[PDB]
Amino acid sequence: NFRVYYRDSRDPVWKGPAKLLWKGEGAVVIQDNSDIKVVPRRKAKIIR
Amino acid sequence: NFRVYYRDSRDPVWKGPAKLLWKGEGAVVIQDNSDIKVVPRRKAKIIR
Amino acid sequence: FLDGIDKAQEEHEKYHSNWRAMASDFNLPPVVAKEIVASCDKCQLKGEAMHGQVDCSPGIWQLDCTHLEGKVILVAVHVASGYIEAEVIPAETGQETAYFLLKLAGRWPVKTVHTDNGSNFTSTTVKAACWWAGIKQEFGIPYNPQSQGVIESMNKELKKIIGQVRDQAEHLKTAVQMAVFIHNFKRKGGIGGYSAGERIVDIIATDIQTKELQKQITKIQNFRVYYRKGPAKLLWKGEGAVVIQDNSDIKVVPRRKAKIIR
Amino acid sequence: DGIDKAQEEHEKYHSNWRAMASDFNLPPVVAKEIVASCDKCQSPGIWQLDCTHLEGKVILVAVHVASGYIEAEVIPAETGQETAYFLLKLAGRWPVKTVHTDNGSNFTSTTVKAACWWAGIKQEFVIESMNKELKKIIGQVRDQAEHLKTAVQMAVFIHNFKRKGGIGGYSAGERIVDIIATDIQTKELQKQITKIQNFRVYYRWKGPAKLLWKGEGAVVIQDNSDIKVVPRRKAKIIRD
Amino acid sequence: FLDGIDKAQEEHEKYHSNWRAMASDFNLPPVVAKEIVASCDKCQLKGEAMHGQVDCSPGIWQLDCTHLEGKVILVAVHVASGYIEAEVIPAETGQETAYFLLKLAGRWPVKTVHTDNGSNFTSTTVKAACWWAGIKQEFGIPYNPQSQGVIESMNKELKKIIGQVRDQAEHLKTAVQMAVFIHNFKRKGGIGGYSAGERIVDIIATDIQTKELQKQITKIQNFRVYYRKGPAKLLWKGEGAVVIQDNSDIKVVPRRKAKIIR
Amino acid sequence: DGIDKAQEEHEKYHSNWRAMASDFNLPPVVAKEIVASCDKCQSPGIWQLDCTHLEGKVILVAVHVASGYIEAEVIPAETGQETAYFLLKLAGRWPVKTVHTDNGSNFTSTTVKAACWWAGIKQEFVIESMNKELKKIIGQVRDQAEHLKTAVQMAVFIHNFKRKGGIGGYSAGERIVDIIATDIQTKELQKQITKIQNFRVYYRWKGPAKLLWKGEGAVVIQDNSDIKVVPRRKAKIIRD
Amino acid sequence: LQKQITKIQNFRVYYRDSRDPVWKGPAKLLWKGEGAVVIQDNSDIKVVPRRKAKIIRDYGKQMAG
Amino acid sequence: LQKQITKIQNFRVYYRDSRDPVWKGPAKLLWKGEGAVVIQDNSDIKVVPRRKAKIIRDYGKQMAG
DNA sequence: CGGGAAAATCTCTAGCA
DNA sequence: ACTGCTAGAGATTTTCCCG
DNA sequence: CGGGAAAATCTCTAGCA
DNA sequence: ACTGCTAGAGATTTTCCCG
Ligand SMILES: Nc1c(C(=O)NCc2ccc(F)cc2F)c(=O)n(O)c2ncc(CCS(=O)(=O)c3ccccc3)cc12
Ligand SMILES: Nc1c(C(=O)NCc2ccc(F)cc2F)c(=O)n(O)c2ncc(CCS(=O)(=O)c3ccccc3)cc12
């Protein structure tokens, strides 16, 4: 299980932690508060 | 003698050519139309 | 240093120290101070220092609307070659974007189109034109223009060339098509010292020729490979290595380790 | 070493330099000189432009005469301004060198002449059969679109990528891509020939042979209208 | 290829080709096509791909006004150490900037102040406070914030720390001073694994101690050096090299090449 | 090898570890253990706060009692809110550990107590002579400024960097920089000692000596209250 | 067959790895699939994704080859 | 004198060159002027400008030295 | 000398209006 | 005649710790 | 093999809203 | 389940050209 802290949409505030559903080369698919979001890996930090 | 083409102040248009008065590490002092301007070397191109 | 963990935690809840400050002040090892930082939700404020890599396939195109002189220019780039097609459009609607996209798909083999989430590209009109022409629609992650980093870069270059030929034409559409000409045929450099038009002709001809050559190779070279196991499709028999494909996995094998039957 | 076998197969078969540079692993300048020294043997940029009329609208159609690849636009008026815009778009899209038009008032305009002067297009004064096929496909797909220009672009799509034929069964887009790749190879070979047509080689010291290839360890020259391979240190190349 | 020069020039006046396009199309050598590009005034549109390097002296400070929550924060950084001093000010006038600067010069040895060309810093009021305190005023090149790249970076970091302690305080000035505390003493890392306060104390103590040590060295080590020539001030006699200073030029000399008299 | 000479010069002179670690090129933990084993031998963070009154205005003055470095601000009111703001500014500017105040209503406030709790400042309940000197300099430079707070900051400048004295002739700013650099060295030595006070070394195999230094090829230990240097492979270090 | 193998090995591939943003040089094409491309760069057989590769036949083959 | 020379050589200098943006490591200070700093990095005597140098005495000298 | 492990260093990015 | 930088996040190299 | 010279490659930046 | 890039300007390395 992972914790993802992310930066989402026109907003400098960082949200999280979220559940990492998918980690690809370049972007991640996460789930925060039953909302599935696709975030680039520059705007996301994953902690095991 | 040198020709300096430069980018000056809130303006994406490139001006020049100007006479190179001083070339320092990081910036240049040039003279265009009897106006002495200090331009950083990222915003200037010098041709011999 | 187990008391140092509690004291470093109760000062991280005040000051939000980094790991080196707590490791210096409370004699913690770096893994423990890093775990004190990594458990604070208020301290995860930076992402991974990398960049992704866009799809450079021969079929993918990247489309974007740029603005110049109060007019909208719809630009497309072939990501593999850099070949652009731009047009001044009257409005930034999807009805005018679907015409551009159907026209472009009629000109070149457009297989996939990558846009941002502009209303022009997100509309039902562009969605019907792509279904008719057989184009796959990819959309970038919202408010992330780096996903379209090719076409945005070409946007810059297109405007640059327009700034050099704005006085040779009276209207902006003429200067836009003149800049498309200059980018496609009068600017050389790249992966083969090519212009963008020579590179797109080379890329599409190479894709056709290599697909024909591989379709003629794999119908005749019908072998099977046992390595280490199980049967596998022989892809390439070299002198020091053998490339196979089993369980949908293309894998390279030493020549010592495999043997090819049939 | 394979120059000799290529010369014998050319005096037997009169093969192109494409065949000799591929069946014998030759540089293309050497096989080009083999086919050029033979006395027995001594178009991709041409487009054709027309205006058709359908439903009261006017359609500019350009046909690549070597491949049949069409490019058609509904224009708002049969004006030299719209024709010059079409020609500038086409010249920016494809390597256009010559257009063949029908002495119309919109094709002999000064605006089209300036557009052809800027893009470097020769203007000279297949096409009707292509307009007939394009009108057939427009009549086929008129029910699928609300406006005519959408149907025209749909028919251009179907003609260029969905209709196949000829000898190999290729579409017009594959044919124009192969034809223009062949033209790029032709222009690159002409550039490679013009780069070394100003050199003269003194070898073994016999006379000024002409250079055909300068490789990593050997040069290939032609003296007395016959081709020989010489080592690199046993040759002197003078640009004259 | 002398006819190619004229044809490449008359097509560069139309298309503005780069040098590789003209060198490919007209068989020019690269120096000739580069000279055709370099003579066009419309093609000089890019600057040098480098960056400068700010003054990292122990006396230089970089000042900037940043904005947060509708309030103005005047920030100063010690460029050599990263030590910051910020304050929420009522207005962005020069009367309020000169008070901050006179206060800062009273706290620390401020020798030079590098600002942008904001009216606050360009005023006659800040010019009189700097004359009184003995501070030299440097201004960056206008509309180039990279010249102030230290303090702007610290601006970012300051706001970052305020975002972590905004709920621990009621007013913004308290959170600003809390963030100044956290940056100066609770964030370690850098050139010595230091915090910013430890680094500024080390830098200023090192400057004092090294000035005293060199003033005691050069009054006793009074030698002269003849190398290759002429007399020169001996700066450092090493085993394999000798560092001297003649004609205001500090120069390193091999030990084989010089000899020291007096 | 120089540990022995340092022990003899300490039993002769009772030198500090600063002198022994510099006159003999010793690590400071070794000279600190030499001066700590001697039974004969067995403040930089203190500030002092006050409020003065001048021209109807109130001035918060903080004095570093080890150096005389002052820090004064004209505050709009003698309120614990302004005092807590001053203390938070001072704690963010300098390493403040203890303030000594005079049982005022603005110093024993809950706001100042929370500000001292956040910054980690002990609050306990020189300064008057410093206020007298600061008032003398304010009276000297009152003619140079329009407002009082400008004159107060000018006097803080003149006191900290233009008035010299003491034994070496240094200003208060140089003195506080040297004092706080000495405190940083003291805290770094205490961190270095606490990092290796949990180790036990078994050498030559004799008993659990305590580690003083672990170098590139040798360790330095103390067994039976005397110090010896042992090679690296002839020692085993166990964290206990 | 073997002439077609040497024909398909005449194409050059410019590829990229997953965390290196710069394009590696003209590798020799060995095999082309719908999603993977087997190449030979620096005498090392590599498998590139199809999205990370630009396969050309450089038409300055009129000199070398 | 020689003890003062070895004293001034205990200070570390972090410097930069004119077109390299990264800070080079702890060189040994040899001489300090008003505008130039003579250092010894990588067994090479260098002359840095005063504006391109940060001279500290790293107070983790309580271990090494 | 040889593997793990941990520390050190290198690479790279956002945000600073 | 003046000038991008800073701190964190991973990745890779380098040093240490005992056999 | 050895110097110059020229070509090739590496590094790095603005602007893309 | 998706993703910075592109072209130019200097700087540095690498290959060529004859001795
Ligand atoms: N633009 C300003 C930035 C800024 O852009 N930060 C983002 C940024 C981007 C890149 C980078 F490397 C660092 C970086 F911070 C800024 O940070 N500050 O503090 C400014 N302070 C004052 C003025 C207006 C000057 S003026 O209008 O008064 C004038 C100019 C010339 C002459 C006269 C008057 C502008 C700015
Ligand atoms: N910002 C846009 C840029 C841009 O910033 N370029 C500068 C830049 C910076 C960095 C970089 F790497 C490249 C780069 F180009 C852009 O180029 N384009 O073409 C845009 N097209 C359309 C929209 C609005 C999307 S939406 O509001 O309609 C929406 C979003 C999500 C869901 C629904 C609706 C914004 C942009």
Ligand SMILES: [Mg+2]
């Ligand atoms: Mg867009």
Ligand SMILES: [Mg+2]
């Ligand atoms: Mg865009």
Ligand SMILES: [Mg+2]
């Ligand atoms: Mg500013």
Ligand SMILES: [Mg+2]
């Ligand atoms: Mg700013």
Ligand SMILES: [Zn+2]
């Ligand atoms: Zn935290």
Ligand SMILES: [Zn+2]
């Ligand atoms: Zn023939």
Ligand SMILES: [Zn+2]
């Ligand atoms: Zn030009």
Ligand SMILES: [Zn+2]
């Ligand atoms: Zn004692």
